[PDB]
Amino acid sequence: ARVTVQDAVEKIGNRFDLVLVAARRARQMQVGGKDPLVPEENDKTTVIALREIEEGLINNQILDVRERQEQQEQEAAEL
Amino acid sequence: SDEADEAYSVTEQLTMTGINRIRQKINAHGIPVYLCEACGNPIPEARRKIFPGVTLCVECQAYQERQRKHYA
Amino acid sequence: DIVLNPLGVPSRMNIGQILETHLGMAAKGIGDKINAMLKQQQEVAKLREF
Amino acid sequence: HARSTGSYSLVTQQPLGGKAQFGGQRFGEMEVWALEAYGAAYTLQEMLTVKSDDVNGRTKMYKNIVDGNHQMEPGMPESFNVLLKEIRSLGINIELEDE
Amino acid sequence: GDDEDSHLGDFIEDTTLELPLDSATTESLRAATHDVLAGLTAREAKVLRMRFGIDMNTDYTLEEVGKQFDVTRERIRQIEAKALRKLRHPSRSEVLRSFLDD
Amino acid sequence: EFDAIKIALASPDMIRSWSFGEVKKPETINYRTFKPERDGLFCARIFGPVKDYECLCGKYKRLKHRGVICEKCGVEVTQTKVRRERMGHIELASPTAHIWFLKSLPSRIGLLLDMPLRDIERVLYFESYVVIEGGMTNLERQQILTEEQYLDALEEFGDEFDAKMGAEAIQALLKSMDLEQECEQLREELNETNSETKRKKLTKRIKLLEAFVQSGNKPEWMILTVLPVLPPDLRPLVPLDGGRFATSDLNDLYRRVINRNNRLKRLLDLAAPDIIVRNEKRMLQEAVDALLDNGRRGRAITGSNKRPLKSLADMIKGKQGRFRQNLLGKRVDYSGRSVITVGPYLRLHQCGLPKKMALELFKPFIYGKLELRGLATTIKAAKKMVEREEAVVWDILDEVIREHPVLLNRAPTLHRLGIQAFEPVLIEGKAIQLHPLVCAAYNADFDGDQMAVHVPLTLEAQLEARALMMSTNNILSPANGEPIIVPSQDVVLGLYYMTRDCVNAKGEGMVLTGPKEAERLYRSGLASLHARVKVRITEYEKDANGELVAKTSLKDTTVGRAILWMIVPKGLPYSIVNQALGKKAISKMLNTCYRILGLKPTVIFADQIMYTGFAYAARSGASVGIDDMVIPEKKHEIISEAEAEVAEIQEQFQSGLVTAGERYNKVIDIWAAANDRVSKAMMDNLQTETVINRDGQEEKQVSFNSIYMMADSGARGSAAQIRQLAGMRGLMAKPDGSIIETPITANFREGLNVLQYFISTHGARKGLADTALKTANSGYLTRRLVDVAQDLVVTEDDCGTHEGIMMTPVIEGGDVKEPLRDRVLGRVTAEDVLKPGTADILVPRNTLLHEQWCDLLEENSVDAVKVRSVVSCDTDFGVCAHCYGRDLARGHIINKGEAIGVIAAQSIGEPGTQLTMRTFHISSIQVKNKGSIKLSNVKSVVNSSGKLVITSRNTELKLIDEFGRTKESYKVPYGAVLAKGDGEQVAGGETVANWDPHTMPVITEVSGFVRFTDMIDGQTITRQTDELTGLSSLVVLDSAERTAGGKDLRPALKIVDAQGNDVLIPGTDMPAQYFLPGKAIVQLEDGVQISSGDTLARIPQKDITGGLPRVADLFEARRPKEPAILAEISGIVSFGKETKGKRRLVITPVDGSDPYEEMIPKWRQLNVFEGERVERGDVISDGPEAPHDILRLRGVHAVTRYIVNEVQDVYRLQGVKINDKHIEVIVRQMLRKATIVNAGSSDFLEGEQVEYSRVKIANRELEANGKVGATYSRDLLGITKASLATESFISAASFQETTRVLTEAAVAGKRDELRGLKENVIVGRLIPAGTGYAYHQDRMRRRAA
Amino acid sequence: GQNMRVAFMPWNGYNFEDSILVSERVVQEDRFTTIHIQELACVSRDTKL
DNA sequence: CACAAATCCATTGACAAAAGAAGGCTAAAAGGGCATATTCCTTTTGAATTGTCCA
DNA sequence: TGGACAATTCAAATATGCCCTTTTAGCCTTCTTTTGTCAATGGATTTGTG
Ligand SMILES: [Mg+2]
Ligand SMILES: [Zn+2]
Ligand SMILES: [Zn+2]
Ligand SMILES: [Zn+2]
Incomplete structure (x- = not known):
């Protein structure tokens, strides 16, 4: 369980962009197979996105x- | 909260205020009045000694209380 | 057998609940006083006296 | 009582009444203002499109949930189309404009 | 007269709509059928898709089905016989019978 | 997919455009083959198929022929969901007026014709012919013409009349109306014909014509020619098992319409006479009107059973309508409910959810998780698995419950904390274990209260649960920043009893190596749990800028305080737990923990402060017993003395010394006093009664009496409710409020005779009947608030305005009743705050006032701070971040998007639960100007000071000049020393009024000697002295402290002569001795001689109604019954035609256009004269001012400070708290429309009502240009009336009267670019508030780009 | 009802607001376990097919 | 490295069942027409308008 | 002539002829086209083998 998110609201201000950023990051870690930038320990995608936020790397x-770089390297083989 | 407990507060409110009305209807400070302000008869010693400050004699007060009894 | 909460008895005013608790304890005490007489063959000449 | 999905009302494609016919829980007016108080917009959006009344959204959320993808293409709550037809069956033409 | 104000209409359910478990059943059925017809023979799996409602408009009679290969319909039914042959032994049919419950 | 909701009338070609066929027969189904019989109101040909992809007769049943129409029956083969979208239409043989545009607020058919509605209802019922431009040789168009004079006209003009009747009349009339020339002539002849009601009614009608031509409609479209029918599945004909059928009443009303229409078609075909046919058309009118709405007209058509029919207008209108009951308030899947239990073991961030509920709630989740885990091949096999409940599903379940929060919501969701996202803990059993700390927030006790679970499905719904609605992020109320996690009843008693102190217990006197040693002593039985000991404790304090510096010392504490100190975190001081720790002290402890240490440390400390309280309450063995409510000993003597006083007053009433009403009032007062004495007796007997043995001889201390322990700690009870178990339960109040004059002298420990109980049951039922009715008044003030303040949202960062309400502490005669700290805490300064010498700035301008800034301010003790307000905000369409303030559920400033409108509505609505339901109630004169001195009702005499002293009370001092009029007049208090006398003309500077006010005088009447009669020291008076002058002073020993020896005797100073006999009073045969009220210190002692006017002694010396409706009374902006009139314009006032029905009154400035006239009705008192140069926005008379004139005269910063204060008062009265951020946000939405007083140079008329944000943005662009803007006067509205006038119509149609918010919006051609929270909730898309705010912004940017 | 040996005291918050802390002796001894009865009907109707 | 022999790829014929259209049978269901006279139904609350005064 | 005063109106919390005919959609069954189950017939490709 993860009790609070008050660290993220300082890393991503405004606490609503936190929800949006975490929505997109979790969907990106669960729909498209992406490596969590943090040791997963039996924990859902939402909390892993939060922990990634608190390390200051989301x-x-x-x-x-990172997704623009993905688009480029996805369009690298675009010919 | 339990509705008997909101009801209790409502009840103590409903009587505390009524009691303060009826207790403020009685005066004690000294503005010594010696003649009925409605008629002019002298307000006696027993009457003016039961309530120091009664602006009116007994019978004029009863008439006033009746006029109030009809609310207007 | 049950553990009620004493914070209900003052704020609520049902103190008759506490009086019933006391009287029920005493009534059952006379109960167990008989029961420890009925349970050792105690000579009903004494049972009437109690 | 608990209900994930079940029967649904006739005219307004919504859940049913409580525990007699497996009905869902009401999300009243006050329980929408509560979620409006927070910023909970996707919670509120789903609770009045996908869990409740939108039909295509209803059965696509189910598939995306049993296929592990938690996400809904919500759509248009059927009670609003019912109300559109009801206002429109007076002499009132109440459209929806350009996209 | 058994709630705040509830009418008789709040209790009549719609017996027409799918069961959300049932449409997911049907979609997994499509996925399974794709699984089986993807591994089967070119001709056999093709005529199987062509003679049933598999991911296209409605089926054709055995003549209208076989006409695309031009073979007389004894040909196409003879090949669907070995189709059911390949589908018989439980090397391709365990998932399919999984849907068939009892 | 769609962007706005345009609405308008529908032309009959439009109504044909919607249909797919034309209903003709009145038949529905076939009674033996339940196919719908063509072509009635259920018909496959007109309304599409019945079964998916299948003609009716079965010629086609395949997806092959999808799109083809069966040649047999013409039913299209398509989906049967198309039955809910296709419409029909009934070609009426008779035009018929839409009842909405006829019988409404103003009859839109009427004043669009400016024909009185009675005339229209007559011409429609075929009561009268009416001309429609026949020929204007003799007659005009609107002239209603009955049969007699009509047949006259047929004599008069056989032709050129055309005299039509019924709905055909009104349709031909509207087609004959022009709108361009009509609006031209109307505006111009209202400019030419300028009167007061005339031009305003004309301008309303001209606005109607304007709107009609501006939009796309045509006037005749209000008269129906084609009538559309709903699709067949919005009015089902379902089968009930048993052959019964369930039918919408639309099936009945449509069938009635079609019957009447077919019969009329046959009639018109058959050439029936006048009466049959005209009655027929008049009766088709009735069916059309009922099908549109039933009871709006005369009669409500009832059906099979005698209830009335729910027609089309009632499917939208009302709490049982589509809008209220269905569009905002849907039912919901993935949810349940259950009883709740306590679960004292849960962390603050989790809830115990049972397995059998978690397994039916989370079925799809587990199905997918098993198909992933390979435990089931399909969803059918997985369904079988989870249905038979194998062990694998009980592990897959808690795998899916890993990080998945569920929402818990209790029954009346009052404020937003009524819904909170917890994390489930799988539980065996059937009740939802819910934490003890969130019971206060939910308003949930465990008397069977059922709570309800919802599940957030979408990933971002789960993130909003975890990141906003989680329970560990809502520990401060939004209505005020204080915590909501305050430990409630067992926790508080546990902490209190733990952190208290005996005097000589076990282990007293030890010195401990710290707190752990104290705990090792308590768990070993050596020390008592409260035992004064010198323990060394180590407190860490953040003196540094975020550094914890330690400090260790020897504190004089107890074993309990040390044992509880290890639950406090580091940054706190030890002075936070050196006290008994009541609930107030505990809430302060937790609040400053929040303020200093953040949110995570406090969210830990909130349940460690609870576990330890629960544990050390269990250890306490604190119980309650019938020997614990101890009856005082002074009870029987007290009620004896009181009953004896009652008896003596009764006998005096027998003699005739008092009236019945006054003896009643005295009896009530003496019993009230005796109840006060008894409560004080039992309290003083109970609280301290534990006397003990020191080591040592003897001592006294606060008692460990349990009924007093749970009451002093604030855990449960009070000094009042304990009074009814030990003291006496006072005088019982009848339901009217008139108190009964016989008290219940008994208590609950002693019994109660039958009448004492039956008497109390009166108020006990009134109170319960009121709280049982108060449910549906509190949730209705809040609905009004959340609709007026729905569409408000913090939608920028800084408007950059310099304007804000000047917050000063709300003092009432002395120390403040609410300091500057909490009245400015969190709001942002609108100006720099300068030190009281104005040397330099304590705090700069754009400065969020924290706790630390607020106390740095208060230490220098400022009294006025200009903070910004939402009311004086500056953002167009919304509110800026700074002007709102700090947040309150989050410590920091509010984030752009916070829908502060609904937050404000709920912060002001849910404390309404605590408010009452019904209403209830509770140093000289310096002359200024010329004039002579005059008075009346005066009765004075010259004193030993030589002055004049009025013995009278009501006498007034007038300053009358030589002309004879009044120039000044001032109340003359009792016993005034008038230095000057009567009549002498006085100029300025001559203060004829002086006194000593604080000493209530006891001035003399007679002139003679002084003595002391019935005056005794120790019994009736005190033999006191003040050393300041050293001369002894006589204070009457007041009855509340005096001895009971002379408790019933009356001290007094008697006036005598030197010979020793009494000095009578003029005209009274009774002596002149003054009985002295207690606390009257008499200056003059024995032996002295004084004449009249001698102040012999010194005496030491507002009705705010407080019901809840007083809040809705204020928020509605109602004009009181005696509204104080205001000096509408600066300049001097002067009288005119006195009593022109009422008196005349006029204010003429020093220079301006002076003649401003005012009808001041003479029956009401005035407070101005003919020579007063009064200033604007100021009273002339007095009384409750209406809020309109405040806003209109003084300023918008005066309407707020009027509203903000007068509703704050109603909350502090009952003891609530709000922040005034929440009323100023409702004031802004109320005063949110302005009336254009000057068209200026922009596009508004001279008396138009437009939104202030509309009139502001438009002119602000122009004053940004070279051109001029406009001048407006800000208007004001009630929380209901201000909401019905909203930009959106879907937003207004949902809340209040729907048929009017819609029907007006139709004729206006009004579109709706649905932005705002309610409009988006109706249409099932994201909010513009929170996590939806950003999405609406890019859509707002890809809109218009 | 049934009379049982109540004891008025706060016990670890398992009787917090209005809760109750029942013993397992009161379950073992079958004190409050009561019988409820349910009619369930099954009707053989005559469908139109 | 070549001569010979067994299983699939196609048919083809008969023929068997089935449904698609057809022709009749039959209940249903809608018309159609009535001739002593008889001629009228079954709370309170606030406010925005509108007839009715008044200066 | 024009402007207050006071009622009206509206939204908010079970049961009453009938004789006969005639034509229509429902159905019922059987042919006939239309498909589909079985019984054999030659021929590549494969395996058999020295
Ligand atoms: Mg309850
Ligand atoms: Zn008198
Ligand atoms: Zn058909
Ligand atoms: Zn601002």
């Missing part, structure tokens, strides 16, 4: 950077 601008 940070929606970060997710957008």
Whole structure:
């Protein structure tokens, strides 16, 4: 269980962008097979997204950077 | 909360305020009045000694209480 | 057999619940006083006296 | 009592009454304002589209949930289309505009 | 007169709509049928898709089915016989009989 | 998919455009083959198939022919879900008026024709012919013409009349109306004909014509020519098992319409006479109107049973309608409910959910998880598995419950804390174990209260549960930042009893190596749980900027305080637990833990403070027993003395010294006093009664009496409810409120005779009958609030305005009743705060006032801070972050998106539960100007000071000038020293009024000697002295403290002569001695001689109604019954035509257009004269001012501070608390419309009502240009009336009267670009508030780009 | 009802607001276990097919 | 490295069942027409309008 | 002439002729086309084998 999320609301301000960033990160870790950047221990996708937030490495601008790099390297074999 | 417990507070409110009305209807400070402000008869010693400050004699007060009995 | 909560008896005003608890204890005490007489063959000449 | 999915009402495709016919729980007005108080918009959105009344959303959320993908393409709650037809069966033309 | 104000209409359910378990059943049925007809023969699995309602508009009579290969319909029914042959032994049919419950 | 909701009338070609056929027969089904019989109201040909992809007769039944129409019966083969979308239409043989546009608020058919509605209802019922531009040689169009003068006209003009009747009349009339030339002539001849009601009614009608031409409608479209029929599955004809059928009443009303229509078609075909046919059309009218709405017109058609029919308008309108009962308030899958139990072991962030509920709630989850785990091949096999409940499913379940929170919600969701996301713990049994700390937030006790579980399915719903609605993030109420996790009843008693102190218990006097040694002593029986010991404790304090510095010392504490100190975290001081720790002290402990240490440490400390309380209450053995409610000893003597007083007053009533009413009032007062004495006697006897042995001889201490322990700790009870077990339960109040004059002198430990009990049952039933009725008044003030404040949302960061309400502490005569700290805590300063010498700024402008800033402010003790307000905010369409303030469920500033409107509505609605349901109630004069001195009702005399002293009480001092009029007038208090006298004309500076107010005078009447009669020291008076002057002072020993020796005797100073006989009073045959009220210190002692006017002694010396409706009374903005009139304009006032029915009154400025006139009705008192140069927005008379004039005269910062205060008062009265962030947000939505006073240069008329945000953004662009803006006057509305006028119509139609919010919106062609929370909730898309705010923004940016 | 040996005291919060802390002796001794009865009907109707 | 022999790929014929259309049988269901006279039904609350005063 | 005063109106918390005919959709059954189960017939490709 994870009791609080008050650390994320400082890492991703405003506490609503936290929910949106975590929604997208969990869906990205559960729909498209992606490696959690954090040791999973029997824990659902939502909490793993939160823990990734608290390590300061989700940070929606970060997710957008990484997904643009994905689009590029996905369009690298785009010919 | 249990509805007997909201009901209790409602009841003690419903009587505390009524009691404060009926207890404020009685005066004790000294503004010594010696003649019925409605008629002019002298307010006696027993009457003015039961309530220091009664602005009116007994019979005029009863008439007033009746006029209030009809609310207007 | 049950563990009620004493915080209900003052705020609620049912103190008759506490009086019934006391009287029920005493009534059952006379009960177990007989029962420890009926259970050792105690000579009903004494049972009437109690 | 607990219900995941079951029967549904006739005109308004909604769940049924409580524990006699396996009915769902009401999400009244006050219980919507509570979720509006927080920012809980996807909770509220799903609780009045997918869990409740939208039909396509109803049965696609089920498949995406048993296929592990927690996500809904909600759609349009059937009670609103019922109300659209009801207002419209007066002389009132109440459209929905361009997308 | 047994709630706050509830009418007789709140209790009439819609016996037309699917069971949400049932549509998921049907979709997994489609997935299983794709699984089986993907591994089967070219001609055999093809005529099987062509003679039933498999992922297309409604079926054709055995003549209208076999016409695309031009073979006389004894040919196509003779090949669906060995189709059921391949589908008989439980190397391709355990999941399919999984749907068939009793 | 869609962007807005346009609405309008529907043209008959439009209504044909919707249909797929035309209903003709009135038949529905076939009674033997339940196919729908063509072509009635259920008909496969017109309304599509019945069974999926299948003609009716079965010619086609395949997806092959999908799209084909069966040649046999013409039924299209498609889905049967199309039965809910296709419509028909009944080609009426007779035009018929839509009842909505006829019998409504204003009759839209009427004033669009400006024909009185009675005339229309007559011309429609065929009562009268009416001309429709026949020929205007003799007659005009609207002239209603009955049969006699009509046949006259047929004589007069056989032709050129055309005299139509019924609905055909009104349709031909509307087609004959022009709207361009009509609106031109109306506006122009209302400018030419300028009167007061005339031009305003004309401007309403002209606005109607304007709207009609602006939109796309046509006037005749209100008269139906084609009537559409609902699809067949929105009015089902379902079979009930048993041959019965269930039918919508639309099937009945449509069938009635079709019967009447077919009969009329036959009639018109058959050439029936006048009466049969006209009655027929008049009767088809009735069926159309009923099918549109039943009882809006004269009669309500009832059906089979005598209840009335639920027609089309009632399917939308009302709590049983589509909007209220279905669109916002749907039922929900994935949910259940169950009884709740305690579960004292759960962490603050979890709830015990039973296995049998978690297994039926989470079925899809487990099905997918098993198909993944390979434990089941299919979903059917997985269904069988989870149905037979093998062990694998009980492990797959808790695998799916791993991080999945469920929402728990209790019955009346009052505020947002009524729904909270917990994390399940699988439980055997059937009740939902719910934490003890959230029972307060839910308002849940365990008397069988059933709570309800919902499941968040979508991943972002789970993240909103975990990240916003989780229980460990809601530990502060939003209505005020204080915690909501306060330990309630067992925890508080446990902590209290633990952290208390005996005087000589076991182990007293030891010195301990810290707290662990104290605990090892308590669990070993050496020390007592409360035992004064010197323990060394180590407190860490964050003196540094985030550094915990330790400090260790020897504290004089008890074993309990040390044992409980190891549950406190580091940053706290040890002075937080050195006390008995009541519930107030505990809540302060937790609150400052929150403030200093954050949220995670406090969310730990909140349940460690609970586990230890529960444990050390279990250890306490605290019970309650019939020897614990101890009856005082002064009870029987007390009620004896009181009953004797009652007897003597009764006898005096027998003599005729008092009236019945007054003896009753005295009896009530003396019994009330005796009940006060008894409660104080039992309290003083009970609280301290534990006297003990020191080591040592003897001592006294606060008692360990259990009924007092649970009451002093605030855990449960009070000094009042304990009074009814030991003291006496006072005088019982009848349901009217008139108290009964016989008390219940007994208590609950002693019995009660039958009449003493039957008497008390009166109020006991009134109170219960009221709290049982108060349910549906509290949840209705809150609905009004959340609809007026639905569409408000913090939608920017800083408007950048410099304006805010100047918060000063709300003092009432002395120390503040609410300090500046909590009245400015959290709101942001709108100006720099300067030190009281204005040297330099304590705090800069854009400064969120924390606890620390607020106390740095208060230490320098400022009294006025200009903070920003939502009311004076500046954002267009919303509210900026700073102007709202700090948050309250989160410590920090509010995040853009927080739907503060609903938060405010609920913060003001749920404390309404605690408010009452019905209403209830509770140093001289300095002359200014010229004039002579005049008075009346005066009765004075000259004193030994030589002055004039009025013995009278009500006498007034007027300043009358030589003209004879009043120039000044001031109340003259009792016993005033008038330095000047009567009549002498006085100028400024001559204060004829002076006194000493705080000493209530006891001034003399006669002139003679002084003595003391019935005056005794120790019994009736005190032999006191003050050393300031050293001369002894006589204070009457007041009855509340005086001895019972002379308790019934009356001290007094008697006036005598030197010879020793009494000095009578003028005209009274009784002596002149003044009995002295207690606390009157008499200056003059024996032997002295004084004349009149001598103050012989010194005496030491508001009705706020408080019901809940007083809140809704204020929020509705109601004008009171004696509203104080305001000086509408600055400048001097002057009288006019006195009593022109009422008196005339006029205020003329120093320079401006002076003649402002005012009808001041003479029966009411005035407080202005003919020479007062009064200032604007100020009273002339007095009384409850209406809020309109406040906003209109003084300023929008004066309407708020009026509303914000007068409703705060109603909350502090009953003892509630809110933040005034929550009323200023409802004030903003109320005053949210402005009336244009000047068209200016922008596109508004001279008396139009537009939203302030609309009139502001438009002109602000223009003053940004070279052009001018407009000048407006801000209007004001009630929380109901201000909400019915909203931009959206779907937003208004949902809340209040639906048939009017809709029907007006139709003629207006009004569109709806549905932005706002309610409109989006209706249409099943995301909110614009929270996690939906951002999504609505990009959609708002890809809109318009 | 049944009379049982109540004892008024706070016991580890398992009787917190209005809860009750029943012993397992009261379950073993079959004190409060009561019998309920249910009619369930099954009707043989005459469908139109 | 070649001569010979067993199982599949196609038919083909008969023929058997089945349903699609057809022709008749039959209950249902809708018309159609009535001739002593008889001629009228079965709370309280707030406010926005609208007839009725009043200065 | 024009502006207060006071009622009206509306939304919010079980049972009453009938004789006969005629034509229509429902159905009922049987042919006939239309498909589909079985009984054999030659021929590549494969395996048999020295
Ligand atoms: Mg309850
Ligand atoms: Zn008198
Ligand atoms: Zn058909
Ligand atoms: Zn602002």
